[PDB]
Amino acid sequence: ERVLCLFDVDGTLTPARQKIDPEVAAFLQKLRSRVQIGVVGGSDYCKIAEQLGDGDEVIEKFDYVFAENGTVQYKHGRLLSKQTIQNHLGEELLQDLINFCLSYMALLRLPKKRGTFIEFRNGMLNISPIGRSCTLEERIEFSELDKKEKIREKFVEALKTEFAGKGLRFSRGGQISFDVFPEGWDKRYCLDSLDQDSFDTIHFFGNETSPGGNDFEIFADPRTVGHSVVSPQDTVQRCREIFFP
């Protein structure tokens, strides 16, 4: 009867990369009268906060905010966190990765390039092979080129092969980029800390719980009761069925 509902963000509580519907927001606070509620996303904290409230309201609206798959953690209004990838991987492997990426991208000759090809985050390296778009027009242009030439896809194939067996994982940063993160640093990462918070049950909700999806591992983990949803309205209905029948 100490219960947590933990939600993926994009596609689960909000439209992808966009603001939460106020009616969903309002339900979550109603759900909060029965259970603790938390979010876990691949995005950084700034992005997640932006989608879920104004300023830093998200840490007040939710009992847990797990950004970068849980490598960044807010707990009951306070920053508990955090871990760094360089600490976990070690400098040698990290630099092997980086120099392989640098060398690969140097040989890519595209219509055009921008900057910040490799960004250090807490939970991952975000790799943007064409560079980060400066406008929406460039972002769309880059997306289309990536689809036609399979830029990110082919880069990841080369990376996975080069680092076979060395414990690196690769996932989409949506369009434009992909993340590189240590094995185990998918959404499951947040479960290790949650393990110590004495929940009787942890319900996880996500919209990519199929194999390949960025919710799969946390959905499938024996530490959670898993729920697959297709939309924020689906999520709200499932919560009503389980907690307010």
Number of residues that bind Mg ion (CB under 5 A): 8
Annotated catalytic residue 54:
no
Minimal distance, residue 14 CB to Mg ion, in Å? 9
Using DSSP's 3-state secondary structure scheme, residue 88 falls into helix
Residue 87, CA atoms < 13 Å, CB-side half-sphere: 7
Of 99 and 210, the one with the shorter C-beta distance to a second copy is: 99
Annotated catalytic residue 10:
yes
Residues forming the site for a second copy (CB under 8 A)? 84, 86, 91, 94-95, 98-99, 102-103, 105-120, 125, 131-132, 134
d(CA 16, CA 183): 25
- H-only helix segments in 7-80: 22-31, 45-52, 58-61
Residue 140 CA, chain-centre distance (Å), reads 22
**Contact pattern from residue 184 through residue 223 relative to Mg ion, giving x for each residue in contact according to CB under 5 A and a dash for the rest:** -----------------------x-------------x--
Q: Which residues of 148-165 are buried (b: 16+ CB within 10 A; e: fewer)?
A: eeebbeebbeebeeebee
Of 27 and 181, the one with the shorter C-beta distance to a second copy is: 181
The single-letter DSSP state of residue 68 is G
Minimal distance, residue 109 CB to Mg ion, in Å? 34
Binding partner of residue 207 among a second copy, Mg ion, none, CB under 5 to 8 Å per kind? Mg ion
Of 120 and 244, the one with the shorter C-beta distance to a second copy is: 120
Of 133 and 228, the one with the shorter C-beta distance to a second copy is: 133
Are the CB atoms for 74 and 64 separated by under 8 Å?
yes
Minimal distance, residue 58 CB to Mg ion, in Å? 16
Options 10, 63, 146, 186, the catalytic residue? 10
Are the CB atoms for 136 and 146 separated by under 8 Å?
no
Binding partner of residue 226 among a second copy, Mg ion, none, CB under 5 to 8 Å per kind? Mg ion
Residue 69, class by beta-carbon neighbours within 10 Å (0-12 exposed, 13-18 middle, 19+ buried)? buried
**Active-site amino acid positions:** 8, 10
Residues near Mg ion, by CB under 5 A: 8, 10-12, 207, 221, 224, 226
